[PDB]
């Protein structure tokens, strides 16, 4: 029975790290090209 506000805080925390993780993940896109 978590409040919506509490859930939102949890989501924001996860969202915040997700964006940072996504940025780092997208960084490796450079090495996703193995064509030569």
């Amino acid at each position: 029975a978590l409040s919506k506000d509490k859930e939102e805080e949890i989501r924001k925390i996860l969202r915040n790290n997700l964006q940072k993780t996504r940025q780092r993940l997208r960084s490796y896109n450079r090495h996703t090209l193995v064509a030569d």
């Binding site: 029975a1 978590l2 509490k6 949890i10 989501r11 925390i13 996860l14 969202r15 915040n16 790290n17 997700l18 993780t21 996504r22 780092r24 993940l25």
Partner: protein, 148 residues
């Protein structure tokens, strides 16, 4: 995980000393009142008793250093918050196996209404996987939730 540094604790001890003018290790109404009067504050006797009573968690009639430590730490007196934290674990730990796996995390992320790759989940789990056991434990989850 989060602990006060020696410098902060030293300041805390000094703060106790600030109220404990006689240095007897005990702070009473007279000492507290004297400190407030020294600060130019003029509290009533009832208010002074209320101040001690409110922060007198042990109910020993006095405010000990531990009581002051939490007092000046501005810690919440709501211990029912532990239940709320536990409930969050229950929500995330849908399978109730006591642990949060990548699949369980993926379901939470999926419920957000976004599509992400398994690799992203694995990377997120990996980063939050301090012990590197391939699973997220309670301590690891707490670190994730206390992340800012």
């Amino acid at each position: 995980a989060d602990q006060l540094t020696e410098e902060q604790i030293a300041e805390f001890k000094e703060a106790f000393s600030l109220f404990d003018k006689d240095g007897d290790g005990t702070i009473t109404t007279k000492e507290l009142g004297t400190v407030m009067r020294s600060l130019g504050q003029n509290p009533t006797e009832a208010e002074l008793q209320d101040m001690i009573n409110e922060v007198d968690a042990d109910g020993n009639g006095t405010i000990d250093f531990p009581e002051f430590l939490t007092m000046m730490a501005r810690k919440m007196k709501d211990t029912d918050s532990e239940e709320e934290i536990r409930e969050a674990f229950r929500v995330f730990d849908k399978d109730g196996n006591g642990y949060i796996s990548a699949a369980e995390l993926r379901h939470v992320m999926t419920n957000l209404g976004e599509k992400l790759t398994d690799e992203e989940v694995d990377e997120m789990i990996r980063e939050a996987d301090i012990d590197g056991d391939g699973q997220v434990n309670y301590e690891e989850f707490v670190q994730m939730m206390t992340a800012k």
